[PDB]
Design a protein around this nucleic acid. Structure first.
Lengths: 207, 140, 143, 255
RNA sequence: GGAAACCAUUUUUAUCGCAUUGGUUUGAACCGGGUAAAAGUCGUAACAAGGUAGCUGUAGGUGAACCUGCAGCUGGAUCAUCG
RNA sequence: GCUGCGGUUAAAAAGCUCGUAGUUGGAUCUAGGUUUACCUUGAAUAAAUCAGAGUGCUCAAUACAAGCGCUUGCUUGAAUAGCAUCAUGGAAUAAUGAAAUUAAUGGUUAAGAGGGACAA
RNA sequence: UACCUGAUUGAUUCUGUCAGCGCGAUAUGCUCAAGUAAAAGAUUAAGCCAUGCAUGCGAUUCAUUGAAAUUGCGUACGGCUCAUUAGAGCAGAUAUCACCUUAUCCGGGAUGGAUAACUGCGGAAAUACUGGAGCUAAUACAUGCACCCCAGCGGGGUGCAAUUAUUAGUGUUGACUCUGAAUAAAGCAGUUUACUGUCAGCUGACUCUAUCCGGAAAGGGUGUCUGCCCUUUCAACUAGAUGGUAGUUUAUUGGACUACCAUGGUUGUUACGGGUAACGGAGAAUAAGGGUUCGACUCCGGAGAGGGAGCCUUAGAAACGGCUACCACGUCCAAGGAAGGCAGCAGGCGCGAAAC
């Protein structure tokens, strides 16, 4: 069927090459996963050596990573925003490695407050809900407050990240290959790369 | 004179290969049409059927009529003339007869005073012509 | 400048966003040099530089192993890749004389070796299949 | 072929086994394991040719089923087991003990030994690394991996391995001044004292070795096995003491 | 929750049709070349200054060999001829 | 026909010249009292065949056997040689590179090679 | 044994071939006292095949020692042939810090329900075809039996492997994004012996089966450098073509494929095209030296199983003594259907000079 053979091409000089043999099993290819956004769907595929791969067809949750804070929380992929390879992929909502998508902010906000006992650019006129208070205003002994005080020492957050957290939809880049590892684990954009891709996205939506 | 430099191997080899084609033996053995032109197709022996018998005026200064037979090879259907050795052996060859034929000896060239005849009969009707001449056997 | 394409490029094995560095305000982006070895001393443009190239010996993910050849650069028209010419002599026993032969070895030319022109000698190290025809990386410019 | 191979033709079999040309179409293929195909011997070949213990291979398999033979102290019933170099073979019923050794020619010879000899064997250090849980290990050229070895043990060094105790007794170093065996090359079966080491960075390095007779020859590391310290050999060598006789010398010895 | 038939679609794609193209072989009225063949017809072209010296290139003509014009060569029938 | 052919008349010198690729290229650097190319020696180099020791399978092709004591045994032979890569040494031969606070500061000669100038 | 001899002339010396002369391969004539080794349908028709065989053997035994059946294992080895094939394939050296693995080695890791034989009911002309019904077994099927976070009283997590992101540097290699130590998640389906016969004296010791991780070994996929037939009545060739970036696929790298982009890449040091009565090598014949020719064939590597293509199972196949479809050609039919692949051994027809 689908083959990755080097023959069937033209030689470096432009000559036709002979076909050395009939198509071999060890040089096969498989149809693209072409994963989309929707209810979790992953298939097992038996591969060479008895190993097995996870081909994602539809993914909604991403076990995303925040690099600076060194945290890893399960958020939900919301929408595709920009793709360098082709824009048909962003139009069709394909989750491919290096694709730029939008994720929720609630899980990372919850972790941030539960770990730093401080607000994350919370709303300037809305009282924290009961679940938020259950982790923000909680009261425990000073021996337990000491660790939180130590963790507060290094807790400033960048303006661009704060604005994304304000909108509630964070920009992220997929770092995994859903057609190979079945998961859409990506990382949250921050800093120079975030600004570059935000400028690209703004330029396109202006275009 | 020929080149003699220490870095002229390409020129020497290419010139030798080019000039090998001007050699009768090399060209004859590597032309490519040898099989199509040679009635036996590169073999040493062949089988065929008799059509007619002829007498060929031997070349000067010899005076005689050599008794050959026109045969059709079974492998390819080509028409050839084959010589019937020994005395009074054409009698043992009748029209529409199966014969084994071989080369005359000079590798596709006529032999002796027989003009244009380069094959010779080695068996007729599955019998050895020498045996037929020597009386060791009879016509089947 | 370094980012001129559709995507954003970075070294995979550098955390551009570390809490300590970002808080201290450091703009010294660490750069990964893999110290090619085999007595090859990393060029200063490789050790300090700003270009990104996933195929560079010092700023990419291409180890150097196998065999190390020397040649004369023939053409530089592709993007970051050249054509090196190796010339040798072939001996024919029958004629006891030699003949001139040559082969072209297309090799990836890192932007570190910015001083590359048709004529300069170059050293090239074997690397894994890097394109349809590229399997060698420029390592040293003997000039 | 479509997969791995199970057979090994007589001609394609390594020459050091000395298998008679008109002696069948196949040669007993050594199975994968401690040693390599071209650097080992089948127990079936041992019992059929070296010791004449089996007139035929059916007899060899009959002897081998009786669980009378021990290799490394572990009773084996695989006539295709790769009994290779520095391998101990103890037939308890006959109380016979042998250790595999390389004849000067390079062939394997029936090296009879006593119980004290059979009680131990040597192993070269093929590598040293760190398995999970942070327990360092070493791997020998015969595949034996030993946990928690002495940190000073490094690549190409010899270690005495105790069959009875499965422990490393002594560690001989690969350094200038140690009796070293020579396993491969055209100097298979040659014993000599290590000398200078030509160090090639990206290729197998070269060693120089001089025997007791003074003759000097070099080789690659992979063929160099240390068999002792100073001049003493940690095991008994066959008749010849690791000396290559030239053909005239061999004839002279014959008459 | 698992699932068979079936439906749609994507891909690998045998196979069949025209169409183009490459290579090999081959019939053919008739029109020509070469060769061979003991004793066919016409002449005499060449070998002697071969009876117009021969030959090369070129052009024309004639039953045929060949003849003629122009320029060359000696492989000529002159190694030479008197200032 | 590289070793190793022939070209006046036997087959064979292009009508003649210019010219790119190719081939080939003058002499000259420690005589005395950095790169290459090349040569030497080693490393890595499946057998079977070829070359090559021994052995009365009755000889030999072959084969790789066998040969002594005496019974519960000892010794055996089944050898030896046969582009590219790497390294060591050699520095003739053939290419190739260097310079246009002190020191001799740094350019070989000018071919019975070649080019150009001048004279009449 | 570094060799020549006859033939152009009335005669001579040359040039030059023809012929003779030695070996070897294939075929064949005549003839052949008995014995020993011993090639043998390669050449053309990788043409077609009647008939027989060539792959079958621990757990589960209420049949009569072990039948039948279910599992497990193997059938990817071995054997045959040389059609295709001219940066294919092979040889030597060499990478795989770009990869995948059963068998064998070393280390670490006494739970329920259904199904056959068996009983019986049956269908079809015909298969190594099978549906129901009643059981009934399992190594089949299923189920598994010191640091981090909150709070230093106490609660949880941490096996291996693994996705992503991050931290420091317990070991190497020439060099590692390699291996170890950690940190945050989450699914992931993989694994940490409900196995057979047991024996010795509550204590022990086996044989066996199953089973993941790490390293070997063996095997394979790919990459690099050098060499390998003829042809110019083939001189220019190439458009996924050469490269860049982002992806997809794969075991992995890669224009392997996709999107965008650039105009590149080979060539008289012979590119490109064409031919081969071309599988490559180890080698064979001849043979002063230098060589010329060949090599289907017992070993190594490659390819194929009438021609193509696509797949299941698996550690391993694009398998064909496995399946699926098309084409060519057959076989049995009760005309509704069912089948086949000897370039395995032995034989048969054809083809042939040519092979049991």
């Amino acid at each position: 069927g689908i083959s990755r053979d080097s023959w069937h091409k033209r030689y470096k000089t432009g000559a036709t090459q002979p076909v050395p043999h009939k198509k071999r099993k060890f040089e096969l290819g498989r149809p693209a996963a072409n994963t989309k956004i929707g209810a979790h769907r992953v298939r097992l595929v038996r591969t060479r050596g008895g190993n097995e791969k996870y081909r994602a067809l539809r993914l909604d949750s991403g076990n995303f990573s925040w690099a600076s804070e060194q945290t890893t929380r399960k958020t939900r992929i919301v929408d595709t925003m920009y793709n360098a390879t082709n824009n048909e992929l962003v139009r069709t909502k394909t989750l491919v490695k290096g694709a730029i998508i939008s994720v929720d902010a609630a899980p990372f906000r919850q972790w941030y407050e539960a770990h730093y006992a401080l607000p994350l650019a919370r709303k300037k006129n809305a009282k924290l809900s009961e679940e938020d208070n259950a982790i923000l205003n909680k009261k425990r002994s000073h021996h337990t407050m000491k660790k939180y005080t130590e963790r507060q020492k290094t807790a400033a957050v960048d303006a661009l990240l704060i604005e994304q957290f304000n909108t509630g939809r964070l920009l992220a880049r997929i770092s995994s290959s859903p057609g190979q590892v079945g998961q859409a684990n990506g990382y949250i954009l921050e800093g120079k790369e975030l600004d570059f891709y935000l400028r690209k996205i703004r330029a396109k939506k202006a275009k | 004179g020929k080149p003699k430099g220490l870095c002229t191997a390409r020129k020497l080899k290419t010139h030798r290969q080019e000039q090998r084609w001007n050699d009768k033996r090399y060209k004859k053995a590597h032309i490519g049409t040898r099989w199509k032109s040679n009635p036996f197709g590169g073999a040493s022996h062949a089988k065929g059927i008799v059509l007619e018998k002829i007498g060929v005026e031997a070349k000067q200064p010899n005076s005689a009529i050599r008794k050959c037979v026109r045969v059709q090879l079974i492998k390819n259907g080509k028409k050839i003339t084959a010589f019937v050795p020994n005395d009074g052996c054409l009698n043992f060859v009748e029209e529409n007869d199966e014969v084994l034929v071989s080369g005359f000896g000079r590798s596709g060239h006529a032999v002796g005073d027989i003009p244009g005849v380069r094959f010779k009969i080695v068996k007729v009707a599955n019998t050895s012509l020498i045996a037929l001449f020597k009386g060791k056997k009879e016509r089947p | 400048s370094e980012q001129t394409e559709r995507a954003f490029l970075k070294q995979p094995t550098v955390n551009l966003n570390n809490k300590a560095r970002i808080l201290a305000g450091s703009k010294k982006t660490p750069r990964y040099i893999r110290e090619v070895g085999l007595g090859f001393k990393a060029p200063r443009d490789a050790v300090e530089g700003t270009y990104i190239d996933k195929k560079c010996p010092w700023a990419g993910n291409v180890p150097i192993r196998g065999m190390i050849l020397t040649g004369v650069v023939l053409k530089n028209k592709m993007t970051r890749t050249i054509v090196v010419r190796r010339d040798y002599l072939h001996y024919i026993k029958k004629y006891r004389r030699y003949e001139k032969r040559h082969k072209n070895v297309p090799a990836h030319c890192s932007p570190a070796f910015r001083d590359i022109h048709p004529g300069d000698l170059v050293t090239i190290g074997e690397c894994r299949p890097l394109s349809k025809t590229v399997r060698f990386n420029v390592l040293k410019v003997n000039k | 072929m479509r997969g791995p191979k199970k057979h090994l033709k007589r001609l394609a079999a390594p020459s050091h086994w000395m298998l008679d040309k008109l002696g069948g179409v196949f040669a007993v293929r050594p199975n994968p394991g401690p040693h390599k195909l071209r650097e080992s011997l089948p127990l079936s070949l041992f019992l059929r040719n070296r010791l004449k213990y089996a007139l035929n291979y059916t007899e060899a398999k009959k002897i081998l089923t009786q669980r009378v033979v021990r290799v490394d102290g572990k009773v084996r019933t695989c006539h295709k087991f790769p009994t290779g170099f520095m391998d101990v073979v103890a037939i308890e019923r006959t109380n016979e003990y042998f250790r595999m050794l390389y004849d000067t020619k390079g062939r394997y010879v029936v090296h009879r030994i006593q119980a004290a000899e059979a009680d131990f064997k040597l192993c070269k250090v093929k590598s040293v690394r760190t398995v999970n849980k942070g327990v360092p290990v070493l791997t020998t050229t015969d595949g034996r991996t030993i946990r928690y070895p002495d940190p000073h043990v490094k690549v190409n060094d010899t270690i005495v391995f105790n069959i009875s105790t499965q422990k490393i007794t002594d560690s001989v170093k690969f350094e200038p001044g140690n009796l070293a065996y020579v396993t491969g090359g055209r100097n298979v079966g040659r014993v000599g004292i290590i000398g200078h080491r030509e160090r090639l960075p990206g290729a197998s390095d070269i060693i120089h070795i001089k025997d007791s007779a003074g003759h000097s020859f070099a080789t690659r590391i992979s063929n160099v096995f240390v068999i002792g310290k100073g001049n003493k050999a940690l095991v008994s060598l066959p008749t010849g003491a690791g000396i290559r006789l030239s053909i005239a010398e061999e004839r002279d010895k014959r008459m």
